[PDB]
Amino acid sequence: EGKLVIWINGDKGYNGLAEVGKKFEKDTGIKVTVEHPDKLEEKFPQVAATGDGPDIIFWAHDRFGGYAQSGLLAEITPAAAFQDKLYPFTWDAVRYNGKLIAYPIAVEALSLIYNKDLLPNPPKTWEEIPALDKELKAKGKSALMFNLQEPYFTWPLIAADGGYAFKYAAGKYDIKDVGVDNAGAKAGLTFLVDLIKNKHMNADTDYSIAEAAFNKGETAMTINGPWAWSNIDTSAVNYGVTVLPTFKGQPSKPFVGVLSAGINAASPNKELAKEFLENYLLTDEGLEAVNKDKPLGAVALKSYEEELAKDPRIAATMENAQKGEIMPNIPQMSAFWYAVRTAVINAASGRQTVDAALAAAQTNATHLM
Amino acid sequence: GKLVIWINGDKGYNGLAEVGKKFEKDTGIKVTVEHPDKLEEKFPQVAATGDGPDIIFWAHDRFGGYAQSGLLAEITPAAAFQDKLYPFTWDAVRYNGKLIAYPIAVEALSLIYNKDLLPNPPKTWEEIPALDKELKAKGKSALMFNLQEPYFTWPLIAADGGYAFKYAAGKYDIKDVGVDNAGAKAGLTFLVDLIKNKHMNADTDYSIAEAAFNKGETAMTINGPWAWSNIDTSAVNYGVTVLPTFKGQPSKPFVGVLSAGINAASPNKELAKEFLENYLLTDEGLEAVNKDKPLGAVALKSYEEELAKDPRIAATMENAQKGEIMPNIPQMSAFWYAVRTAVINAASGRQTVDAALAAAQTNATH
C-alpha cells in the first residue's frame, strides 16, 4: 500500500524527477509516480484533504502559506545536520507560524543582464544610469529597458529605500502565557517526584552532594555543564558526556546560554569592532587562541565547532543545546525561576502535591509581573 | 581609534588579548582587554553616560535588557558571514527583530556518566528506576544531580511540553503595508523621472524589453533565469550580475523558492521525508532534475557550490540573498493588484506619484 504520488508543474524537469523516483523504487520497492496536471496548485487544496491528493507537491513557497493556513501541509522536522545542508534564508521561505512546512529546492530572483559588447563593465548604481544612457544614445543605443508594466520587475528599486509589502513582525516572548502549569510540566515533575518517592533519588540532593558522589564513583550518572568537567578530570573517574535522556520519547530540553559580543551603541569605534569580531575573533585562529586560554565549550562558528566536536563531550554539549531552548532574554525570567524553585522543592518534599505546586507557581510567576 | 573590550574574569581574556595584539599588528589600532568585577552591572551604568567599553562579552540573555535601553548597536553582517555561524545562535542575539550581538560560544547541560560503572548510559528517563535497582545491588546509585535549582530539573520538566514563556512566532502584519511611505515614493519618483527624462518609455513591457535587448538595441535589461535561453538563441554576448543600488542600498528583488510540501493527510509521510531528504536533496538527485530542465540556483549548499561556477547562477544567488523572500500569505494578491495600478498610472501622466501610492495603500488594506 506504500507509494509516492508527486505533483510538479509541467515546466519543471519532471522526467528528471521520475529518474530519482526510479532510483528510490529500485532501493525500497516503493513505486514513485510523478504527475504534472494542469492547474495543480488550484487542484491541491481541492483534493488534498479528501484522501485522493498527492503525497508531495512542488510549487513556489509563497503559495504554501495559504495551504498552511488551512492545515493542508505536514510539519516537517529534519534533523539539525540536515537543516545545515541548505541555506538558512531558504528555510525562512518555508516557515509558517514558526513551523517548517516544506523542503526548499531552488532559488530564483531577478538579476541585471547586460550586453558585454555594448557595455563591458555594467553600472554599480541606479544613479549612474541617466548619464550612461546619454553616452549610449550618441551611438543610437539605450542604457536600460525592462518590463515597467509588472510591479514584480519595478519593486526591487521601489523597495531599496524602504518600500515593503507587509511588515514582518518579529517573534516575541509572550509574558502572559506561562507554561509551568500544563500537562507536560506536570508529567515531568511527577516523574521526578516519583523518583524521590521510590527512593531512586533523595529530595535534599544539591550541587555539592551530587558532584562529590559522582567524582567519588558512588553514582553512575550526573547532570551537569562544561564548568564541571575539570573537577571530574582530576578524579579517578573515567567519564563520558552524552545527550540527555528522553522523557515520553521527547528530548530533555536544557536552557542554552550563548556567550555573545555586543557593541556599545555610544562607541565611536563600531566599524573597528565589527572588523575585529567578524574577521579576527570569529575565525578558527581567533577562537583557538581564546579556547586554549580557557575552554569555550562548543562554539557558534561552524568551521571551528567541527574541529572542537572531535571531542565527544563538546559534540554532546552542542547536541543538547540544539534540542534545548535558548534562555529567554527578558527580565521576567527572574519571576519564573523564583516561582519554579519553590514549586519543585515543595513537590520534591511532599509539602504540596504536583498539581498544587505548579498551580501556585503559575499564579506567582504571572503576579510577580 | 581604539578598542576597549570587557569580558568576565572566568573567560579566556589572555587568549582574547592575543587576538587583540594581532589586530593591532595589522591595523595600528590598540585593543585593550579588561575584566572588571561586576562588569554586567557596570555596563548599563557607564554605557548610559556614554563612557563604557566598545565591546562587551556576556551571556546573550542579559543583552535583552541592554537592547531594551538602546545600549547596543544593531549589527548587520553580510549573508556570507551570517552563514558561518549556526542559525540558532543568531536567534539568541535577536531582539525586536534586530541582531544586537555576535554569538561566540554555546553552553548547555549534558548527561555525564561513569564508563566503568555504566559503559552505555540510558537513552530514556523511564529506564532509570530499573537501572538504579540493579546498581543498588552493588551499593551504587544510577543518578544524582542538583534537585534544589530549577535550572537542573527544568530539562526533564520541559521535555513533554513545559515552557517558561511562549515564544509567539514571527508573522507578516497585514495591517502594516508600506507602499505609501517615503522610501516607496523615492524609488517610484526616480522611476517616473527616468520616464519624464526620456531614458525609459512608460509603455515598455516584457516583450518590448526582451526584443530590444536580444536585438542588441539596449545595453541592459532586468530579468530572471527563465529569460536566459532566449538570449542564448540571440547574437548577444551577455552577462548576468548584481542589481544596481539606489541611494547606496541594494535593489531588493523578491525571492521565489521552489519548494516540496508533504500532504498532511498522506499515509506516506515517512516515505516522502526519506525520498526528499536522502534521494532528491543530494547532488545526484538535484543533478538528475537539473539535467532535464535547469533549476537555476539551488537551496542545497553542496550542489549550489558546483552550479555557481556559472557566474549567472552566482549572480542569481547574490541577488536572492540581498532580496526579500516573497511573503507567503494570501494578501499578496491585493498588494500586487493595487501596486500594478499605481506604477502604471504614475509611469503615465494619469496620476501623480503621491496620489497613485495613496490610492494603492487604501486598496491594499481591506
3-class DSSP string for B308-323: CCCHHHHHHHHHHHHC
Q: Does the CB of B292 have a partner CB in chain A at under 8 Å?
A: yes
Tell me the C-alpha distance between A6 and B190, whole Å.
Answer: 45
* A358/A179 Cα distance (integer angstroms): 10
Q: What is the DSSP letter of A75?
A: P
C-alpha–C-alpha distance, residues B181 and B59, integer Å:
38
**R_g (Cα) of chain B, nearest Å:** 29
Bridge partners for A263 per DSSP = B55
The CA–CA distances, whole Å, from A138 to A91, A229, B237 equal 48, 75, 21
Alpha helix ranges (H) inside chain A: 14-28, 40-47, 61-69, 80-83, 88-93, 129-137, 151-160, 183-197, 207-215, 229-233, 270-276, 284-293, 302-308, 312-323, 333-349, 354-367
Which cell numbers in the block locate residue B341?
Answer: 495600478
Hey, of B14, B21, B109, B266, which one would you mutate to test binding to chain A, going by the most A CBs within 10 A of its CB?
A: B109
**In chain A, which among 180-219 make CB contacts under 8 A with chain B?**
180, 182-185, 187-189, 191-192, 195-196, 198, 200-207, 209-210, 213-214, 217-219
CB A301 within 8 A of CB A281: no
Q: Is A312 helix (H, G, I), strand (E, B) or coil?
A: helix
Q: For B354, phi and psi rounded to 5 degrees?
A: -60, -45
Q: Cα torsion at B222, B225, B229, B231 (round to 10°)?
A: 20
> What are the Cα distances from residue B100, in Å, to A83, A278, B175?
24, 14, 27
CA angle B198, B202, B205 (to 5 degrees): 125
- Cα–Cα dist A17/A1, whole Å: 22
Q: Which residues contact B100 (CB under 8 A, 6 or more apart)?
A: A262, B63, B66, B67, B72, B73, B74, B75, B93, B94
A187 to A310, A355, B162: CA distances (angstroms) = 36, 10, 9
State whether the Cα torsion A297-A301-A307-A312 is positive or negative: positive
Cell triple for A65: 502559506
**CA pair distance B214, A31, nearest whole angstrom:** 44
B232: number of Cβ within 10 Å = 10
Residues of A in contact with B79 (CB under 8 A): 89
Distance CA A292, CA A290 (A): 6
Residue bearing cell 515533575? A189
Looking at CA atoms only, how far is residue B309 from chain A in angstroms?
16
B128 to chain A, closest Cα gap in Å: 8
3-state secondary structure chain B: CEEEEECCCCCCHHHHHHHHHHHHHHHCCEEEEECCCCHHHHHHHHCCCCCCCCEEEEEHHHHHHHHHCCCECCCCCCHHHHCCECHHHHHHCEECCEECCEEEEEECCEEEEECCCCCCCCCECCCHHHHHHHHHCCCCEEECCCCCCHHHHHHHHHHCCCEEEEEECCEEEEEEEECCCHHHHHHHHHHHHHHHCCCCCCCCCHHHHHHHHHCCCEEEEEECHHHHHHHHCCCCCEEEECCCEECCECCCCEEEEEEEEEECCCCCHHHHHHHHHHHHCCHHHHHHHHHHCCCCEECEHHHHHHHCCCHHHHHHHHHHHHCEECCCCCCHHHHHHHHHHHHHHHHCCCCCHHHHHHHHHHHHCC
Angle between helix A284-293 and helix B13-27 axes, rounded to 10 deg = 140
What is the per-residue burial (b if ≥16 Cβ within 10 Å, else e) of A166-204? bebbebbbebeebbbbeebbbbbbbbbbebbeeebbebe
Q: Are B225 and B316 in contact (CB under 8 A)?
A: yes
d(CA A165, CA B204) in angstroms, rounded, equals 24
Strands B324-325, B30-34: parallel, antiparallel or unpaired by DSSP?
unpaired
Cα–Cα distance, B78 to B113 (Å, whole number): 42
> Is the Cα dihedral B262, B268, B274, B275 positive or negative?
negative
Instruction: With residue A261 as reference, give the H or E element that holds it.
Output: strand A255-263
Cα–Cα nearest to B4, from A346, A80, B96, B23 = B23
Among B86, B316, B345, pick the best mutation site for testing chain A contact (most A Cβ within 10 A): B86
Is the CB of residue A184 less than 8 Å from the CB of residue B161?
A: yes
Method: X-ray
Domains along chain B with CATH numbers:
2-99 (3.40.190.10), 112-170 (no CATH), 182-252+326-364 (3.40.190.10), 269-322 (no CATH)
> B191: closest CA among A201, A359, A202, A146?
A146
Q: Quote the Cα angle for A44-A46-A47, to 5°.
A: 70
Q: What residues of chain A lie within 8 A of the CB of B356, using their CB? A: none
What are the backbone angles phi and psi of residue A8, rounded to the nearest 5°?
A: -145, 150
A135, A161, A232, best to mutate vs chain B, most B CBs in 10 Å: A161
Query: Using the beta-carbon criterion (under 8 Å), do A76 and B335 form an inter-chain contact?
Result: no
Distance CA A13, CA A310 (A): 41
Query: What number of CA atoms fall less than 13 Å from residue B282's CA on the CB side?
Result: 13
The reply to whether residue B19 touches residue A280, judged by beta carbons under 8 angstroms, is yes
Residue whose C-alpha is closest to residue A137's, from A156, A118, A150, A151: A118
Q: Which of B168, B257, B35, B189 lies closest to A65, judged by CA?
A: B257
**Closest residue by Cα to residue B194 from A3, A130, A134:** A130
Q: Beta-carbon neighbour count of residue B300 at 10 Å?
A: 24
